[PDB]
Amino acid sequence: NGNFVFDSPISKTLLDQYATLPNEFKFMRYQAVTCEPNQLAEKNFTVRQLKYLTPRETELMLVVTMYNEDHILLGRTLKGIMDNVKYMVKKKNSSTWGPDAWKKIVVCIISDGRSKINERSLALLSSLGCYQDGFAKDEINEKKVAMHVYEHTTMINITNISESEVSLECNQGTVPIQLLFCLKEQNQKKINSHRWAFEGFAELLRPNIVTLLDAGTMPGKDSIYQLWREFRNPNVGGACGEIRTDLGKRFVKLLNPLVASQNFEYKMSNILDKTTESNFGFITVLPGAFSAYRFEAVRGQPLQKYFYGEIMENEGFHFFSSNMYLAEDRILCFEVVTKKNCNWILKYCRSSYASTDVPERVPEFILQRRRWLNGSFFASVYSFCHFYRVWSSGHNIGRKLLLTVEFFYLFFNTLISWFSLSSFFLVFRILTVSIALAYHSAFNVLSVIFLWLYGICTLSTFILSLGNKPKSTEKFYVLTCVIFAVMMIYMIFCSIFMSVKSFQNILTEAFRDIVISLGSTYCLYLISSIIYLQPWHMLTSFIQYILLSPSYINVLNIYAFCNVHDLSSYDEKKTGYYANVRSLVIIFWVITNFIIVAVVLETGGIADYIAMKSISTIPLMTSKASIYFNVILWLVALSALIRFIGCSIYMIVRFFKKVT
Amino acid sequence: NGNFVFDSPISKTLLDQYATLPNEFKFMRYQAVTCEPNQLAEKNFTVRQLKYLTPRETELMLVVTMYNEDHILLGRTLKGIMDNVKYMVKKKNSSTWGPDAWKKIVVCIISDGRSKINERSLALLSSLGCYQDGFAKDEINEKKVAMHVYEHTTMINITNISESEVSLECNQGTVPIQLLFCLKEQNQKKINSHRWAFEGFAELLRPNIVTLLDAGTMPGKDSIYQLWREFRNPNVGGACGEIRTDLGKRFVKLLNPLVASQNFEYKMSNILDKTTESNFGFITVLPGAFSAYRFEAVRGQPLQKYFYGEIMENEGFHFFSSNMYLAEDRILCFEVVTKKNCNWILKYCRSSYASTDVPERVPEFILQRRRWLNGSFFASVYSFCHFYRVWSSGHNIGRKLLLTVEFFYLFFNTLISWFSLSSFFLVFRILTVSIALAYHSAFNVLSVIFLWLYGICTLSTFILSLGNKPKSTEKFYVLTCVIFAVMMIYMIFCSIFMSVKSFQNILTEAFRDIVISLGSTYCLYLISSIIYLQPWHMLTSFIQYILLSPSYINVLNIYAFCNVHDLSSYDEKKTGYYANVRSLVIIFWVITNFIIVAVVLETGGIADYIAMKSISTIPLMTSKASIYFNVILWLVALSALIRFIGCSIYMIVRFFKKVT
Ligand SMILES: NC(=O)OC[C@H](O)[C@@H](O)[C@H](N)C(=O)N[C@H](C(=O)O)[C@H]1O[C@@H](n2cc(CO)c(=O)[nH]c2=O)[C@H](O)[C@@H]1O
Ligand SMILES: NC(=O)OC[C@H](O)[C@@H](O)[C@H](N)C(=O)N[C@H](C(=O)O)[C@H]1O[C@@H](n2cc(CO)c(=O)[nH]c2=O)[C@H](O)[C@@H]1O
């Protein structure tokens, strides 16, 4: 049909394994694609699934993305998938998953560039019988090729994963898998790969559900099946399973403090936040590593906004229309909820889990968090600045009201997180000075030293994040984290010391109240973990996270706000606009935080002004500090309480549904 | 000789003008150079000057550098040169400059790249008969050409410069000029352009004196001749004239405040600093726009250090060995003074002047000053960190001692300038608070507002200089300068107000002393200007400079320290080292200044610590502020006094030499 195709018989050894035979098992198809993803249909590109005498009906289509992963991570992910399909076909009382479930299940593996792909994994892929060199063409009839499509259905299954080798076997218990290997001619953006999946192949495949995976992610032994079960309600359009750190063999990785704190964080985010948000019906972010979308729900407006942005735009740049790309993923969720005349919702099913690797060194950790913080902030402001769209959807009145209250709660979250830095120093200074004034022994020298340490660390972090890169200077970041850990240790010691002394004296008072409130939040965390029935997470070095806490409050935030856009003709004007908007958020951040600090501690000449106005007719401490300190933990207790109540509701309805 | 040469007869019209005739007048030589500058000799490249039957003896060789200048600036510079040579030949009583003195002089014009050269000026050059297209070759016998050499001796002289057109004429009063047009095949560093002059052509030309000019610089009607006269002393090896800001026709540019302040600065630097430094015998910097070097003195070690750097170096990077390039020009001066077994000195002759254009908009002004500030700081630290070399030279003991004391004085200059920012804010705060405490009327609100304004401006400048570029954001810099001008206005008003009130009361006291000292420095400036016999410069909007002063103290310095290296395999390691060293000077700067501010104003918890130590047994102001404020103007008066004394000595010896 004017296009280049090539069929090469499957490896004779692989054919012998298959024997251990209809045409699709014995051969590999190769197609060369030279168009952008949205011409696969009418430019006469096809797949085997439609070439049979009776076209195959796709019930699930699976996508995984590779950039440079070695064969271990990919092997693990496909081990999970093949196990899950084996359980799928093993089901008896399921028409969707009977003797030939894989007939309705095809797995697509989206590479990114031959140059950066790890041939170390191409070895395994060739072992599976879906990849052979020799017939790769970079340009066809003066048309540059866009992607290579390799297409085979194997019989070999992965069965064990050792730290070094990948165990594959072919027996009578194996289950056929339909493969779709796509190799982008050159390395491209992950969103482009998603477009190749959604805007492209999915259109021909006509799938009922599309699940986004990620190389190195472990589906549970039945997590995919459970996720599919969640879609029996005709209202859900997206869903996501709990994601936990893969830790290490015999939990060895749990030695690393960073891994320990990250583990506790992953657990919390999946115990309070997601259950609370899924109670209302809107989830802030579906993890890109593991998510599922009903295809018909997402087509149209969502993919438009995701791949193109707000088309309605003049020649000049606008804030949203040229900044929404930093919330690339989150916007999808928003767009499905408030679609016109459609009542789609999102759901969080806790019993489908996935274990993933995490960054292990400070540079990679920071370079990862940066994207997440920027995306979260931009998506939150975009959602709150356009919430009225929810009233233009097809929801009933109750859903609409619940979505409204949820939006207000989320904006309260983003605002309280915006002024976190000011509270951090404001609290530390108040407690340190309070105790030093109280007892006089040796906190006096300590107070001065700690203040200087915090100032130098805060400044140096600003300078380094604005000018330098994390890769060049790794030692200083580790030292900064250590210093913040020491400061947090001293803060806790002061708190407990004052609490004990005040208890003896009653045998100040607001600090007895603060220890009440801190005990309250810790006990509520414990109860929340107890309800979920995974209470060893609190024992997973949660204290290690507490020590690293200050770092996240005074290091991740500064870097995230100091590297907003990652800058490097129309291009120069765009770069100038990006640089201008980057250096304008930071100044606002510092000024707004310092306004609170000045109002409370009475620095910046305010004390001098007050004292000398009274002369017209300075103190060491005022009641303002006491009031502020009471208020901050008032708020912390409130947040913990509302989140605990939400978690209980989610678990209660989940259990009640199980009872029914 | 295995090389490509090409002779084309001079324009017939130009030939007719010449008639209005020996061979060198009637033809243009063209040579193609394909080696690096230090093979012009032994790779058999020659020039006409040596091709005559009796080789011509070069008494002066002149170099001018072009990057993109239009025909006006170049035309002005060559107008100056031809006038000066006309006066040179017009001289009667001289053993050297006779009727054929022009033959002993050759002018070399070093371009930089065909791509960026202004063909708008190539028009004028072709008019002069030293440039014709058609026979340009970019590569000769698989060897890339390095430079095009065009060679002619004209008879036309420039006679008037209108804002639009260049008046050229050919009459009986014109004087022949020997030209050497060297258009670099590709644009490159100006130092590389100089490398072609000194390490290259000069070796064949064997000149007695080489004068560095710059496109757009006006030699005086006799400045070149005077500069040559300065070399009759067999000890001088370099000398420089005096640069005057171009006020423009009827001082039209003067209206611009920036031009006015720059004019006053150019005058001062040439009235106190250079005369004082030339009294001892070492000049900090010979202006690249206008300078003169005795060739034999500079050959050897100086060009080695200038073009290559400290060869003695390991694989790793060292501070000096890889940072000296930022003081590219200044080092030359140092190297001539402390040459081994040579007693060369530098001299400053005031009566040779040169008028040049200056940057007129804030972005270009800042992008210019940056290089000067970085070069000055690095050269000063390099000189003071290696001063013992002076004792290894061939000077007598008296010269050696004078050079020692001068080096100490220069390091005192660089140190006092290093802690200028801290003094700026420290003084402003002390005066504003002092007055506000004094009188209570409305300085109270003003004091608080001014403090906040300074803080925001200082912060915003830090952020913008670290992250952004001056080109993108021009408006904010102008606003910053305006704000600093307003702050300086208020500072002056407070000073005079307190002085007047204290005078009435005596009809605090340290501030009566400060007004004494400020009157002292202003009157010493006036007397210094009076002695030099150019006292209209004080009337050239010197007050406009005073208003812009704060800006230079709190804007030029921050940008200079925040863009030290201009960063953008061995290259990546080098870039990492540059980025590391860049972000380490800044932190030192801030910490050292804030240490002074904390010690004096007693901020940073020091007051809290003192008060609560006394509790173990805070004020609004202490005597420390009074002591510091007295000391700072003590120092300012000292500097003004020593500089005035030096200026007088220079003028006295100059006059005495004239008397003798
Ligand atoms: N909560 C949660 O997300 O889990 C953690 C999450 O799994 C991470 O830990 C996980 N290691 C991870 O980074 N996955 C990436 C992602 O999808 O974001 C995958 O995208 C692919 N990719 C990415 C880029 C740069 O964006 C590219 O240029 N090309 C490209 O191909 C690549 O295959 C990468 O693996
Ligand atoms: N006190 C004092 O110096 O006077 C002020 C001084 O004259 C300035 O105002 C004067 N406008 C000026 O900038 N002259 C430059 C200089 O010599 O530094 C000349 O160097 C040339 N050049 C420069 C670069 C970049 O460095 C290049 O890449 N290529 C290149 O050819 C260029 O011809 C430029 O004109």
Side-chain angles (χ1 to χ4, degrees), chain A residues 2 5 7 9 19 21-24 27 30 32 34-35 37-41 44 46-47 49 52 54-56 58-59 61-78 80-82 84-89 91 94 96-102 105-127 129-132 134-136 138 141 145-150 153-154 157-164 166-168 170 173-177 179-181 183-184 188 191-198 200 202 205 207-213 215-241 243 245 247-248 252-254 256-266 269-276 278-285 287-295 297-302 304-309 316-327 329-334 336-360 362-377 379-394 396-421 423-434 436-452 454-468 470 472-474 477-499 502 508-511 513 517-532 535 540 542-543 545-546 548 550-601 603-617 619-653 655, chain B residues 2 5 7 9 19 21-24 27 30 32 34-35 37-41 44 46-47 49 52 54-56 58-59 61-78 80-82 84-89 91 94 96-101 105-127 129-132 134-136 138 141 145-150 153-154 157-164 166-168 170 173-177 179-181 183-184 190-191 193-198 200 202 205 207-213 215-217 219-241 243 245 248 254 256-264 266 269-276 278-285 287-295 297-302 304-309 316-327 329-334 336-360 362-377 379-394 396-421 423-434 436-452 454-468 470 472-474 477-499 502 508-511 513 517-532 535 540 542-543 545-546 548 550-601 603-617 619-653 655:
Chain A
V5 299
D7 185 73
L21 206 56
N23 64 7
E24 62 295 338
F27 298 91
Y30 171 40
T34 179
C35 66
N38 56 6
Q39 290 81 15
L40 271 293
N44 295 318
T46 62
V47 305
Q49 310 293 342
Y52 300 78
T54 301
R56 285 243 173 86
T58 302
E59 183 65 30
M61 182 205 58
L62 277 297
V63 295
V64 300
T65 77
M66 293 164 342
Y67 183 49
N68 44 6
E69 274 77 21
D70 61 45
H71 63 71
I72 290 299
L73 278 296
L74 187 153
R76 259 180 42 186
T77 299
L78 281 112
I81 299 234
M82 271 156 277
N84 227 313
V85 176
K86 195 176 293 287
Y87 175 81
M88 277 315 238
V89 59
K91 186 59 70 61
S94 76
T96 61
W97 323 116
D100 188 349
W102 65 97
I105 308 175
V106 293
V107 299
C108 168
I109 306 170
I110 296 292
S111 113
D112 192 71
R114 264 199 279 102
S115 62
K116 274 312 241 3
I117 190 167
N118 218 323
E119 188 269 358
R120 175 61 160 295
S121 304
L122 294 174
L124 186 145
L125 294 174
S126 47
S127 307
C130 295
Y131 153 67
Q132 288 168 358
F135 36 86
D138 55 10
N141 283 312
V145 76
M147 182 167 60
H148 300 293
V149 167
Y150 295 14
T153 181
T154 178
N157 295 6
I158 303 304
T159 49
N160 200 28
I161 301 303
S162 64
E163 71 275 15
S164 63
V166 232
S167 306
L168 61 86
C170 185
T174 64
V175 58
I177 305 303
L179 278 295
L180 283 184
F181 181 76
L183 230 170
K184 320 188 74 173
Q188 318 295 349
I191 184 181
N192 181 21
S193 306
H194 313 137
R195 191 173 313 181
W196 287 105
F198 282 111
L205 271 293
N208 189 20
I209 298 99
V210 175
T211 287
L212 309 171
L213 275 172
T217 296
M218 274 321 194
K221 208 53 66 188
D222 62 4
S223 282
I224 300 299
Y225 161 76
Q226 305 188 186
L227 207 47
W228 173 90
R229 275 209 48 230
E230 276 293 333
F231 281 11
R232 299 267 311 295
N233 186 350
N235 287 319
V236 234
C240 70
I243 310 303
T245 181
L247 221 181
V252 56
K253 303 245 194 199
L254 205 44
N256 175 11
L258 173 59
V259 167
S261 64
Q262 199 167 180
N263 181 10
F264 180 76
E265 298 308 273
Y266 282 26
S269 169
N270 290 25
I271 209 284
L272 298 187
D273 297 3
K274 283 208 189 310
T275 58
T276 289
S278 176
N279 267 343
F280 301 132
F282 176 42
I283 200 181
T284 312
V285 64
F290 191 72
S291 293
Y293 294 147
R294 185 187 295 271
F295 190 45
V298 65
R299 291 183 72 196
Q301 184 86 322
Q304 278 274 5
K305 295 282 286 300
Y306 181 36
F307 291 153
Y308 301 89
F317 313 96
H318 301 89
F319 182 76
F320 287 143
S321 178
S322 194
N323 286 288
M324 73 188 70
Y325 64 92
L326 280 164
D329 235 314
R330 267 150 286 271
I331 64 168
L332 293 174
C333 312
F334 188 57
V336 233
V337 162
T338 62
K339 199 179 181 179
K340 199 184 268 306
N341 293 318
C342 295
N343 47 358
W344 303 123
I345 57 184
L346 281 299
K347 191 146 292 304
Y348 171 66
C349 173
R350 68 185 277 267
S351 307
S352 73
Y353 68 100
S355 61
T356 55
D357 60 324
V358 289
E360 300 178 356
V362 168
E364 180 63 27
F365 172 75
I366 287 179
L367 284 173
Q368 179 193 81
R369 291 307 178 91
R370 196 260 301 184
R371 284 206 333 275
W372 290 13
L373 270 194
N374 290 344
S376 160
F377 168 71
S380 287
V381 65
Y382 177 82
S383 76
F384 186 68
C385 190
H386 285 131
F387 75 98
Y388 60 85
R389 202 86 63 69
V390 71
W391 292 89
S392 77
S393 71
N396 62 13
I397 307 309
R399 172 72 58 177
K400 279 184 168 184
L401 299 161
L402 278 186
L403 289 186
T404 297
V405 63
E406 177 199 331
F407 268 66
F408 284 157
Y409 164 85
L410 270 66
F411 186 74
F412 169 69
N413 239 339
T414 196
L415 174 104
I416 189 164
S417 183
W418 166 276
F419 291 103
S420 60
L421 180 57
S423 303
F424 180 96
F425 171 82
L426 191 34
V427 172
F428 159 73
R429 186 59 173 179
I430 295 178
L431 173 58
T432 315
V433 173
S434 299
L437 187 49
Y439 289 162
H440 295 88
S441 171
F443 314 92
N444 316 353
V445 177
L446 296 174
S447 66
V448 178
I449 307 304
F450 277 92
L451 171 60
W452 286 88
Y454 176 89
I456 304 176
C457 302
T458 303
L459 171 57
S460 48
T461 312
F462 265 107
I463 297 293
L464 278 174
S465 296
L466 278 165
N468 204 318
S472 167
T473 175
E474 168 180 326
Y477 285 135
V478 174
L479 177 72
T480 295
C481 287
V482 173
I483 298 165
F484 276 108
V486 176
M487 293 179 358
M488 184 88 218
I489 287 290
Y490 180 53
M491 287 191 292
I492 293 311
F493 165 81
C494 284
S495 200
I496 69 165
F497 184 71
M498 266 159 49
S499 64
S502 186
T508 62
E509 272 288 289
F511 303 94
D513 303 353
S517 161
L518 211 66
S520 172
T521 185
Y522 158 71
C523 300
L524 296 169
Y525 273 133
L526 175 61
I527 291 172
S528 312
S529 297
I530 291 170
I531 294 289
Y532 194 89
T540 68
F542 107 89
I543 290 297
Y545 153 63
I546 310 304
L548 305 182
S551 173
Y552 311 111
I553 310 303
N554 303 51
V555 168
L556 291 188
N557 284 359
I558 297 169
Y559 191 96
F561 282 168
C562 286
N563 274 337
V564 171
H565 272 196
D566 180 20
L567 61 83
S568 63
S569 176
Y570 190 35
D571 288 333
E572 274 80 331
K573 275 183 276 278
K574 191 190 63 175
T575 301
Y577 167 76
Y578 280 1
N580 266 353
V581 71
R582 190 262 283 281
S583 86
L584 188 153
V585 163
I586 294 154
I587 300 169
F588 280 10
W589 183 38
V590 178
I591 294 180
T592 61
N593 291 324
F594 182 83
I595 288 182
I596 313 302
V597 119
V599 161
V600 176
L601 294 174
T603 63
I606 299 288
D608 281 63
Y609 180 75
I610 298 290
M612 181 274 288
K613 263 172 64 180
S614 50
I615 297 169
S616 167
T617 63
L620 268 279
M621 186 177 59
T622 61
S623 199
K624 312 186 194 170
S626 164
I627 303 304
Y628 182 60
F629 188 167
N630 283 356
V631 175
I632 205 62
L633 306 172
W634 195 282
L635 276 296
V636 167
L638 187 79
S639 182
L641 166 64
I642 191 66
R643 290 168 1 195
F644 159 77
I645 294 170
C647 179
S648 65
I649 304 305
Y650 168 95
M651 198 62 61
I652 293 174
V653 55
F655 165 75
Chain B
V5 299
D7 185 73
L21 206 56
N23 64 7
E24 62 295 338
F27 298 91
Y30 171 40
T34 179
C35 66
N38 56 6
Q39 290 81 15
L40 271 293
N44 295 318
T46 62
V47 305
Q49 310 293 342
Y52 300 78
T54 301
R56 285 243 173 86
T58 302
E59 183 65 30
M61 182 205 58
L62 277 297
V63 295
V64 300
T65 77
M66 293 164 342
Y67 183 49
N68 44 6
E69 274 76 21
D70 61 45
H71 62 71
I72 290 299
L73 278 296
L74 187 153
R76 259 180 42 186
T77 299
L78 281 112
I81 299 234
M82 271 156 277
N84 227 313
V85 176
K86 195 176 293 287
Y87 175 81
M88 277 315 238
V89 59
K91 186 59 70 61
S94 83
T96 67
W97 307 118
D100 197 16
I105 310 177
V106 293
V107 299
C108 168
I109 306 170
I110 296 292
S111 113
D112 192 71
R114 264 199 279 102
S115 62
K116 274 312 241 3
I117 190 167
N118 218 323
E119 188 269 358
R120 175 61 159 295
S121 303
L122 294 174
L124 186 145
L125 294 174
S126 47
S127 307
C130 295
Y131 153 67
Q132 288 168 358
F135 36 86
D138 55 10
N141 283 312
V145 77
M147 182 167 60
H148 300 293
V149 167
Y150 295 14
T153 181
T154 178
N157 295 6
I158 303 304
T159 49
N160 200 28
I161 301 303
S162 64
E163 71 275 15
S164 63
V166 232
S167 306
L168 61 86
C170 185
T174 64
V175 58
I177 305 303
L179 278 295
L180 283 184
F181 182 76
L183 202 167
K184 301 175 68 173
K190 54 185 179 182
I191 183 179
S193 301
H194 315 129
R195 190 175 226 164
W196 277 106
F198 282 111
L205 271 293
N208 189 20
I209 298 99
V210 175
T211 287
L212 309 171
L213 275 172
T217 296
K221 208 53 66 188
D222 62 4
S223 282
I224 300 299
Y225 161 76
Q226 305 188 186
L227 207 47
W228 173 90
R229 275 209 48 230
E230 276 293 333
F231 281 11
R232 299 267 311 295
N233 186 350
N235 287 319
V236 234
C240 71
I243 298 300
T245 299
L254 188 53
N256 175 11
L258 173 59
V259 167
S261 64
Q262 199 167 180
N263 181 10
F264 180 76
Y266 282 26
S269 169
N270 290 25
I271 209 284
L272 298 187
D273 297 3
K274 283 208 189 310
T275 58
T276 289
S278 176
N279 267 343
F280 301 132
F282 176 42
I283 200 181
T284 312
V285 64
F290 191 72
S291 293
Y293 294 147
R294 185 187 295 271
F295 190 45
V298 65
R299 291 183 72 196
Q301 184 86 322
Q304 278 274 5
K305 295 282 286 300
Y306 181 36
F307 291 153
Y308 301 89
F317 313 96
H318 301 89
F319 182 76
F320 287 143
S321 178
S322 194
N323 286 288
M324 73 188 70
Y325 64 92
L326 280 164
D329 235 314
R330 267 150 286 271
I331 64 168
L332 293 174
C333 312
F334 188 57
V336 233
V337 162
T338 61
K339 199 179 181 179
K340 199 184 268 306
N341 293 318
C342 295
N343 47 358
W344 303 123
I345 57 184
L346 281 299
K347 191 146 292 304
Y348 171 66
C349 173
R350 68 185 277 267
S351 307
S352 73
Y353 68 100
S355 61
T356 55
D357 60 324
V358 289
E360 300 178 356
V362 168
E364 180 63 27
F365 172 75
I366 287 179
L367 283 173
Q368 179 193 81
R369 291 307 178 91
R370 196 260 301 184
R371 284 206 333 275
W372 290 13
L373 270 194
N374 290 344
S376 160
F377 168 71
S380 287
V381 65
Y382 177 82
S383 76
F384 186 68
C385 191
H386 285 131
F387 75 98
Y388 60 85
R389 202 86 63 69
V390 71
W391 292 89
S392 77
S393 71
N396 62 13
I397 307 309
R399 172 72 58 177
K400 280 184 168 184
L401 299 161
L402 278 186
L403 289 186
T404 297
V405 63
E406 177 199 331
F407 268 66
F408 284 157
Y409 164 85
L410 270 66
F411 186 74
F412 169 69
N413 239 339
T414 196
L415 174 104
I416 189 164
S417 183
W418 166 276
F419 291 103
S420 60
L421 180 58
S423 303
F424 180 96
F425 171 81
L426 191 34
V427 172
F428 159 73
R429 186 59 173 179
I430 295 178
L431 173 58
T432 315
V433 173
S434 299
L437 187 49
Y439 289 162
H440 295 88
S441 171
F443 314 92
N444 316 353
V445 177
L446 296 174
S447 66
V448 178
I449 307 304
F450 277 92
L451 171 60
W452 286 88
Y454 176 89
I456 304 176
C457 302
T458 303
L459 171 57
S460 48
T461 312
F462 265 107
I463 297 293
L464 278 174
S465 296
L466 278 165
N468 204 318
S472 167
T473 175
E474 168 180 326
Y477 285 135
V478 174
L479 177 72
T480 295
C481 287
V482 173
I483 298 165
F484 276 108
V486 176
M487 293 179 358
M488 184 88 218
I489 287 290
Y490 180 53
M491 287 191 292
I492 293 311
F493 165 81
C494 284
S495 200
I496 69 165
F497 183 71
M498 266 159 49
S499 64
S502 186
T508 62
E509 272 288 289
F511 303 94
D513 303 353
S517 161
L518 211 66
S520 172
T521 185
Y522 157 71
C523 300
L524 296 169
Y525 273 133
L526 175 61
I527 291 172
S528 312
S529 297
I530 291 170
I531 294 289
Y532 194 89
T540 68
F542 107 89
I543 290 297
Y545 153 63
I546 310 304
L548 305 182
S551 173
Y552 311 111
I553 310 303
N554 303 51
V555 168
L556 291 188
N557 284 359
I558 297 169
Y559 191 96
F561 282 168
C562 286
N563 274 337
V564 171
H565 271 196
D566 180 20
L567 61 83
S568 63
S569 176
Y570 190 35
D571 288 333
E572 274 80 331
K573 275 183 276 278
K574 191 190 63 175
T575 301
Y577 167 76
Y578 280 1
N580 266 353
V581 71
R582 190 262 283 281
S583 86
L584 188 153
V585 163
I586 294 155
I587 300 169
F588 280 10
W589 183 38
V590 178
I591 294 180
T592 61
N593 291 324
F594 182 83
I595 288 182
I596 313 302
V597 119
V599 161
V600 176
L601 294 174
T603 63
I606 299 288
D608 281 63
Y609 180 75
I610 298 290
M612 180 274 288
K613 263 172 64 180
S614 50
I615 297 169
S616 167
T617 63
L620 268 279
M621 186 177 59
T622 61
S623 199
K624 312 186 194 170
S626 164
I627 303 304
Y628 182 60
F629 188 167
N630 283 356
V631 175
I632 205 61
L633 306 172
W634 195 282
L635 277 296
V636 167
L638 187 79
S639 182
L641 166 64
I642 191 66
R643 290 168 1 195
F644 159 77
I645 294 170
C647 179
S648 65
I649 304 305
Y650 168 95
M651 198 62 61
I652 293 174
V653 56
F655 165 75

